[PDB]
Amino acid sequence: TGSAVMNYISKQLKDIQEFIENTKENIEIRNKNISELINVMINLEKVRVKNDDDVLTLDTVEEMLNFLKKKKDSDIKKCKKLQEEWKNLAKMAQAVKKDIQNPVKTESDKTKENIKKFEEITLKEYANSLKKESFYKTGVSESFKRIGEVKQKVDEFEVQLNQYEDFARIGSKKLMEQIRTDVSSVEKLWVRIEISEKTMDEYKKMKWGSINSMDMEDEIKKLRKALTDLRGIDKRSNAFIGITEELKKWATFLPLLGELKDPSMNSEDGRHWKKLKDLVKKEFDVSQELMLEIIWDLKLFDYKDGIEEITDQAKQELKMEK
Amino acid sequence: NIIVRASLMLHQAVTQNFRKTAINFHYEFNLRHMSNVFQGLLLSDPNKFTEPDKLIKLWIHECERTYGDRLVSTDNLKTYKENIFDIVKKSFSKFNFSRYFGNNPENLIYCNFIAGINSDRFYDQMPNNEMEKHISEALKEYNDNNAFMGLVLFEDAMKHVCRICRIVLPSSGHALLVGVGGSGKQSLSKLASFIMGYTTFSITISATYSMVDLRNDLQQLYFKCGPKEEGILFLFTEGQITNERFLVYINDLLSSGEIAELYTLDEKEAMINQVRAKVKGEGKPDTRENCWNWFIDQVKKNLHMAICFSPVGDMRRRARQFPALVNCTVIDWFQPWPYEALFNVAKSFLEPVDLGDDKVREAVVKFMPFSFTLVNDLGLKLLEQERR
Amino acid sequence: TLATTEFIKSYLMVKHPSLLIGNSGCGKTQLAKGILKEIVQAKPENYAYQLINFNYYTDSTYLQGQIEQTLEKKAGRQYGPPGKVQLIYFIDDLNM
Ligand SMILES: Nc1ncnc2c1ncn2[C@@H]1O[C@H](COP(=O)(O)OP(=O)(O)O)[C@@H](O)[C@H]1O
Ligand SMILES: Nc1ncnc2c1ncn2[C@@H]1O[C@H](COP(=O)(O)OP(=O)(O)O)[C@@H](O)[C@H]1O
Ligand SMILES: [Mg+2]
Ligand SMILES: [Mg+2]
């Protein structure tokens, strides 16, 4: 497996001679080319990468030669001739590399225009994010699709900028990181609001007392703290501030609802419960078991202090009655 | 064998250096204190200790947590630390332990948790860096499922958490926490419980609370840690004791897993029937009162006690009246809050307040501890003079 | 231990009580508890054991409870131990 290694080396020398002939035809085509000058510069860079690999292959050929001579005197004369053919190809490549260097300078200037377009692509994605978080309505699941489509359009802009940077061979990279961190934070806010909306919907279908006030408060209180834990877009916007006020309304609603579910009113019988409904001055229903949805649309926040007085009276009345 | 020579030499030093008195009753170092040091080396799982030098560092930690750190003063702790270092020097050579016994040393701690609450629990050295991170993280999981704890975390408090989490790791092991007023121990124990995975239990104090109501709760508490086999921490304060005879039932639970006049004849037999299913699962084919002697061993494994006594009043008397409360349990005295603790506390509470400027802000957080420490000094200067 | 253990055993086979003094160290309870298991392991029919710790609030009436808890009428001779076999009692913290 040393004489077999010398035979495989001789076959690799024949392959490099044909690869050199192909590299020469590729050099003439780039010479004929110089849009079109930028594509020629890209093919010139790949040929310059192939040329350094060929310069290393020519040295390896000359070593595989000297190995044969000491092992096959004739095989040493063959790969020494291969190194001689590699030097003649390296001379014609340096002439093409000079003309390529003139076009590469013109390409490097156009690279700065590609970097400026990337900066304009990054600023637009920053503004569109401000318009996505607002879009107010129940298209929160749908806005995730509009966000993801934006993330794909940014990711396409990143791959285009990563391709432009390879052609030229910091700030464009930092902007990409900042958008990705904004997208991740936006998505976390959409997931949390959707969970909180689901919990509000689940509570909304409870019995008159199945909620039990304190049990509702604990989940919201945990949810409200765990909302502030997330630090995406530094809150503000519109859609975010609105739901924190909706949660806060929901949070302030339960202690009042707890008084309406307290045993002093649960007793019913007397007209003391009907007097509570007369402050609201609205259409009301009395159900031992029914949806808390109606309670939230009954406007218990309105006539708050009036209700709070009737709750305290009703309690004092029960305690003596008992 | 060197550890066993080392642990003996340590016992001979401390028993000479610290003599028992009517005050500092606990200073008496019985055998069973020595026994708790070697209980900590068993908690050490194999494969997690490749290095020989390291197994000594674990024993050193364990000595301090066991029958160290039960000293009224910081001056006694300084003499105790010196006594070990010189015994550690003579016994162990070719192994350096400088910078773990020097003035201003590096804190060393060994808990079941290192990689965090979430990951697997192997008993090994925790780095001081991850300590601040992991106790903080562990609070957030408590601030989810439990009522908001509202504690400020300072180096000494994190030490106290880990220290309790050791004391409640072994089966028979029970905790006794001695703190002046607002020391920490009552809520620190509720945190410790949750890190270990044990759900905290505390008796509800009432005006109409009888012996039969306590005895009823103790049965339900046994039932949670017995057949159901869930780990249940038991938190007990001076406020929770209305009658002296309640503290009787407690002292029996610390002494052994068996309590007198807890279970009736029927309930005992009814419990043995439930356990009979388990011992067949364990693969010990016994259908006799050996099954009951397995139950109390399983109960005393999954029922730990965290008792919360004030130093000044109603301790020396109760310690004399019940030996179990101080003997059976591993006590950890709480010293006053250090300057480094007070500064961290003051800054958290004053963080929302404006305090005018940014230099002022820095001086006002500096003042709080400086004002507390010199009032505490004047309090001892006053005490010396007028007996105030 | 081996010396002291051998005596307490030989004493309980002659129905002569013993008493274990210690400065809360050297495992008085566990040595005694260990001995009582070794005797019960040998002859589980003849000798049974029951460990009664003494609290600060243990009276005569309370003690009668623990004695009445493990007894019989035993067809005359008044109170007799169950199984017609010699029940060992144990007492811890007799000082208090
Ligand atoms: N508002 C509060 N002020 C002080 N400590 C509080 C407060 N809320 C909860 N705690 C908790 O109470 C624990 C111990 O307080 P306390 O029971 O008064 O002391 P001790 O346990 O020493 O008797 C502290 O660890 C702290 O976390
Ligand atoms: N060889 C041994 N046999 C039994 N217990 C032992 C032995 N060596 C050490 N011990 C320990 O001695 C400890 C001391 O208990 P003991 O002195 O009986 O307590 P008390 O005097 O308070 O009743 C026990 O907890 C036990 O683990
Ligand atoms: Mg307190
Ligand atoms: Mg004992």
DSSP string, A115-164: HHHHHHHHHHHHHHHHHHHH---S-HHHHHHHHHHHHHHHHHHHHHHHHH
Own/partner pairs, A12-19, CB within 8 angstroms, 24+ separation: A12/A57, A12/A64, A13/A61, A13/A64, A13/A78, A13/A79, A13/A82, A16/A54, A16/A57, A16/A58, A16/A61, A16/A82, A16/A86, A17/A82, A17/A85, A19/A50, A19/A54
The minimum CA-CA distance between B89 and chain C, rounded to whole Å, is 28
Measured CA to CA, the distance from residue B68 to residue B83 in angstroms comes to: 11
- Find chain C residues with C-beta within 8 A of B260's C-beta: 52-53, 66
Would you call C61 exposed, middle or buried from its count of C-beta atoms within 10 A (0-12, 13-18, 19+)? exposed
What Cα–Cα distance (Å) separates residue C26 from each residue in A312, B19, B197, C4? Answer: 65, 18, 34, 12
Report the Cα A66 to chain-centroid distance in Å.
Answer: 57
Between A and B, how many CB-CB pairs are < 8 A? 5
Task: Please give the Cα distance from B161 to B195 (Å, whole number).
Answer: 9
Which of B348-382 are b and which e, b meaning 16 or more Cβ less than 10 Å from the residue's Cβ?
eeeeeeeeeeeeebeebbeebbeebeeeeeeeeee
Angstrom distance (rounded) from CA B230 to CA B303: 9
Residue whose pair of structure tokens reads 């990705």 in the numeric block = A180
Rounded CA-CA distance B176/B304 in Å is: 10
| Residue B184, ligand 1, Cβ within 6 A | yes
Atom number, ligand 2, closest to the C-alpha of residue B32: 13
Residue A100, CA distances (Å) to A37, A106, A162 in order: 10, 10, 22
Please count the other Cβ atoms lying within 10 Å of the Cβ belonging to residue A311. Answer: 18
Closest CA to A23 of A52, A56, A59: A52
Return the HEC string of C1-45.
CHHHHHHHHHHHCCCCCCCCCCCCCCCHHHHHHHHHHHHHHHCCC
The two structure tokens encoding residue B140: 């957030």
Tally C-beta pairs within 8 A across B and C: 38
How far apart are the C-alpha atoms of A64 and A78, rounded to whole Å? Answer: 10
- Experimentally, the structure was elucidated by cryo-EM
Angle between helices A214-229 and B128-145 (to 10 degrees): 150
Pairing of strands B330-333, B175-178: parallel
CA distance, residue B66 to nearest chain C CA (Å): 16
**Ligand 1 centroid – CA B149 distance (Å):** 9
Residue with tokens 């306590």: B214
Query: What residues form DSSP beta bridges with C92?
Result: C53
Structural contact between residues B332 and B167, judged by C-beta atoms closer than 8 angstroms: yes
Helix, strand, coil % in chain C, rounded to nearest 5: 40, 15, 45
Report the separation in Å between the CA atom of C35 and the middle of ligand 4, taken as the mean of its atom positions: 14
Q: Whose CA is nearest to atom 2 of ligand 2?
A: C27
Probe site for chain B from A225, A227, A228, A230 (most B CB atoms < 10 A): A225
Distance set, CA B197 to CA B114, B292, B308 (Å) = 15, 26, 21
Residues 6+ apart with CB under 8 A from B353: none
Closest to C55 (Cβ–Cβ): which among B28, B32, B251?
B251
Distance (Å, rounded) from C-alpha B332 to C-alpha A255? Answer: 42
Run of H or E including B199: strand B199-202
Chain C nearest-CA distance from B225, in A, is: 23
Cβ distance of C57 and B248 shorter than 8 Å? yes
Residue of B nearest to C93 (CA): B323
Q: Which residues contact B215 (CB under 8 A, 6 or more apart)?
A: B249, B261, B262
> Ligand 4 centre from B330 Cα, in Å?
15
Scored b (16 or more CB within 10 A) or e, A168-207 reads eeeebeebbeebeebbeebeebbebbeebeeebeebeebe
Helix (H, G, I), strand (E, B) or coil at B220: helix
Is the CB–ligand 2 distance for residue B327 below 6 Å?
Answer: yes
Which residue(s) pair with B332 in the sheet? B177
DSSP three-state, residue C51: strand
Of B31, B260, B321, the CB nearest to C52: B260
Query: What does residue C83 show for φ and ψ, rounded to 5 degrees?
Result: 95, -5
Which 123-142 residues of chain B touch chain A by CB within 8 A? 140
The torsion defined by the Cα of B84, B90, B91 and B93, in degrees rounded to 10, comes to: 120
Of B244, B255, B327, the CB nearest to C53: B255
Helix, strand or coil, per DSSP, at residue B201: strand
Short-list B229, B218, B302, B233, CA closest to B267 = B218
Question: Any CB–CB contact under 8 A between B352 and chain A?
Answer: no
- CA-based nearest distance A317→chain B, Å: 25
Cα distances (Å, whole numbers) of residue A242 to A191, A199, A231, B47, B238: 16, 17, 17, 55, 48
CB B68 within 8 A of CB B60: no
Residue B149 has, within 13 A of its CA and on its CB side, a CA count of 24
CB B235 within 8 A of CB B308: yes
* Sign of the CA dihedral running B272, B277, B280, B282: negative
3 state DSSP class of B184: coil
Amino acid, single-letter form, for residue A193: I
Quote the radius of gyration of chain C (alpha carbons, Å).
15
Q: B330: CA distance to ligand 3 center in Å?
A: 19
Q: Which residue has the tokens 């909706």?
A: A246
Coil/strand/helix, residue A322: coil
Q: Could you tell me which of A75, A79, A64, A174 has the C-alpha nearest to residue A119?
A: A174
Query: What are the residues facing B309 on neighbouring strands?
Result: B178
Taking the C-alpha atoms of residue A142 and residue A132, their distance in angstroms, rounded to an integer, is 10
With helix as H, strand as E and coil as C, how does B23-85 read?
A: CCHHHCCCHHHHHHHHHHHHHCCCCCCCCHHHHHHHHHHHHHHHCCCCCCCHHHHHHHHHHHH
Burial class of residue B135 in the structure, from the number of CB atoms within 10 Å of its CB (0-12 exposed, 13-18 middle, 19+ buried): buried
* Parallel/antiparallel/unpaired status of strands B175-178 and C86-92: unpaired
Total residues found in chain C within this entry: 96
A264 touches A318 (CB < 8 A): yes
Task: Tell which atom from ligand 1 comes closest to the C-alpha of B188.
Answer: 25
B73 contacts chain A (CB < 8 A) = no
Question: What residues contact B119, with CB distance under 8 A and at least 6 apart?
Answer: B113
Q: How many Å from the N-terminal Cα to the C-terminal Cα in chain C?
A: 25
Task: Using a CB–CB cutoff of 8 Å, tell me whether C53 touches chain B.
Answer: yes
Residue type at position B63:
C
Q: Are C39 and C15 in contact (CB under 8 A)?
A: no
Provide the 10 A C-beta neighbour count for residue B72. 15
Chains that touch B (3 or more CB pairs under 8 A): A, C
> What is the spatial distance between Cα B53 and Cα A62, in angstroms, rounded to a whole number?
57
Cβ partners under 8 Å of residue C71, min gap 6: C79, C80, C81, C82
Give the C-alpha separation, A20 to A93, whole Å.
Answer: 10
Strands B303-309 and B175-178, sheet pairing? parallel
Residues B20 and B14: their CA atoms lie apart, in Å, by 11
